[PDB]
Amino acid sequence: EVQLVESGGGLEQPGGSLRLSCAGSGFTFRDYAMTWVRQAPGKGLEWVSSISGSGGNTYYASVKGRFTISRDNSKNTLYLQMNSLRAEDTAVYYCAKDRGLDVWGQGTTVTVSSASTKGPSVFPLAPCESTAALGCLVKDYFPEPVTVSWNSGALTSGVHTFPAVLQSSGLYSLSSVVTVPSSSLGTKTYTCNVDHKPSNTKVDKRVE
Amino acid sequence: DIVMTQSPLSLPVTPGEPASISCRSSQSLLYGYNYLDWYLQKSGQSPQLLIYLGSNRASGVPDRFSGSGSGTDFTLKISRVEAEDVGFYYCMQALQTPYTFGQGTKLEIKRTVAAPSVFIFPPSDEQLKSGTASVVCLLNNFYPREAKVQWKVDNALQSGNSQESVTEQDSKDSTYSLSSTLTLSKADYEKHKVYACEVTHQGLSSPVTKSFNRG
Structure with missing residues (x-):
C-alpha cells in the first residue's frame, strides 16, 4: 500500500x-x-x-x-x-x-493573507413528507479548509457539504446537509462532526 | 517552458458514449518514449495518474481508457464513459523541468431532468443570541444546473443579501445540489414574520415555495 x-x-x-x-x-x-x-x-x-x-x-x-x-x-x-x-x-x-x-x-x-485565524461557529439546520433534511451551518471561519462528516463517518449517503462562500466580512461560511427518511426522525441520531485544524476547533453537534 | 494546449475545455457526455481529449505541446515530447501523462482529479480528491509515457495505463486504470500519440500531439480516449468519470482531466509533460500541465478539461455528465427537492431552515436560537440570522434554502439533487432561488420576506423580494453555493456534479446520480443563505440582522429578523424561498427549475412545472413563520 x-x-x-x-x-x-x-x-x-x-x-x-x-x-x-x-x-x-x-x-x-x-x-x-x-x-x-x-x-x-x-x-x-x-x-x-x-x-x-x-x-x-x-x-x-x-x-x-x-x-x-x-x-x-x-x-x-x-x-x-x-x-x-x-x-x-x-x-x-x-x-x-x-x-x-x-x-x-x-x-x-x-x-x-493579512487576515488572522478564526474558528467557526456551528449552528443546527432543522425544519421549523417522506424525506427530511437536516444540516449544520459552519459560520465565520478563516482560513480554509474545514472538514465535515456525519455520525463520525457512518452516514455518507445523501450528504452534501457545500463549497464555502466568502462573506463580505472576509470570513467563510458553509453548510453541510443530509437528507434522511422522515419516519426515522424520532428514533435516529444525526450529528455533524466539524474540524477546522488552523484554529484547533472540533465540534460534534447532534442536530434535533 | 513547454506550453501544453488542451481541448476541449468542457466535455458534456452521456454515459455509454465515448469521449476524446486532445493535448498539443509546443515542443516534441518524443525523447518510442513520449513523456506525456494524463491525470484525473475528482471533486475533493487529489489528482490520480491515468496514463504515463503517452500510452501506458496506471495500475488500476481500466481497458476503456487509452492514451495514444507521438511528438506534439496526444489523445486521451475513454471508449465508454461512466457517471463516476466526472471530474477534470489534465495532460502533463515530464520531458523537462518545469513540468507543465494543460488548462484541464471538465468532463460533465448529461442525464435526464430531475426536479430539486427543496427545504427551508430557520436560524437557530443559538445563532439569534449573538445578533445574526442566517436563513438557509437547500435544493437537493437536481439536473440541469441552472436554477433560480428567490428569497422573500413578508412577500418582499430580497436581493443583494444572499449567497449561493453549488455542489460539483455527483458521481453516482450526476445531479447538483445548491444551498442559498439569506443573512439578516437579528433586529431585521424580528421585524418580519414570513420567510420564503421560491425555486424555479426546468424540472418543476411551476416554481416551488417553501416557507416558515418566525413564530
Whole structure:
C-alpha cells in the first residue's frame, strides 16, 4: 500500500514562512525522485519543485530563491521550506512519487493573507413528507479548509457539504446537509462532526 | 517552458458514449518514449495518474481508457464513459523541468431532468443570541444546473443579501445540489414574520415555495 501523507500547511502573513512535510510508506523512499505540485483556489495544476532520490539534485519553478526542497530518507519524509511567502503562494500543495506521478498525497492547504485565524461557529439546520433534511451551518471561519462528516463517518449517503462562500466580512461560511427518511426522525441520531485544524476547533453537534 | 494546449475545455457526455481529449505541446515530447501523462482529479480528491509515457495505463486504470500519440500531439480516449468519470482531466509533460500541465478539461455528465427537492431552515436560537440570522434554502439533487432561488420576506423580494453555493456534479446520480443563505440582522429578523424561498427549475412545472413563520 503505497501512501503519501502530508502536513504542515496553514496560514501565514506575506513575507512569513511555512514548512510542509510529506511522509512516505510502503515503498523504498530513497529509490525515488519526489515532486511538489500546487493548485491555487479554483485554478489548475502547477509544478513547484523536484528532488532526486539522493537529494543530490533539486529543481524549482516563481519560487526560485524563496522555497527549498529537501528530504530526510531516514524518516521517509519530503520537505518544502517556504520563505518570503506571497499571496500567489496560496494553494493546496500535493506531494507526488516521481522517477508518471503514480501516487499523490492528500494535499495540505497553504494560505497567505493579512487576515488572522478564526474558528467557526456551528449552528443546527432543522425544519421549523417522506424525506427530511437536516444540516449544520459552519459560520465565520478563516482560513480554509474545514472538514465535515456525519455520525463520525457512518452516514455518507445523501450528504452534501457545500463549497464555502466568502462573506463580505472576509470570513467563510458553509453548510453541510443530509437528507434522511422522515419516519426515522424520532428514533435516529444525526450529528455533524466539524474540524477546522488552523484554529484547533472540533465540534460534534447532534442536530434535533 | 513547454506550453501544453488542451481541448476541449468542457466535455458534456452521456454515459455509454465515448469521449476524446486532445493535448498539443509546443515542443516534441518524443525523447518510442513520449513523456506525456494524463491525470484525473475528482471533486475533493487529489489528482490520480491515468496514463504515463503517452500510452501506458496506471495500475488500476481500466481497458476503456487509452492514451495514444507521438511528438506534439496526444489523445486521451475513454471508449465508454461512466457517471463516476466526472471530474477534470489534465495532460502533463515530464520531458523537462518545469513540468507543465494543460488548462484541464471538465468532463460533465448529461442525464435526464430531475426536479430539486427543496427545504427551508430557520436560524437557530443559538445563532439569534449573538445578533445574526442566517436563513438557509437547500435544493437537493437536481439536473440541469441552472436554477433560480428567490428569497422573500413578508412577500418582499430580497436581493443583494444572499449567497449561493453549488455542489460539483455527483458521481453516482450526476445531479447538483445548491444551498442559498439569506443573512439578516437579528433586529431585521424580528421585524418580519414570513420567510420564503421560491425555486424555479426546468424540472418543476411551476416554481416551488417553501416557507416558515418566525413564530
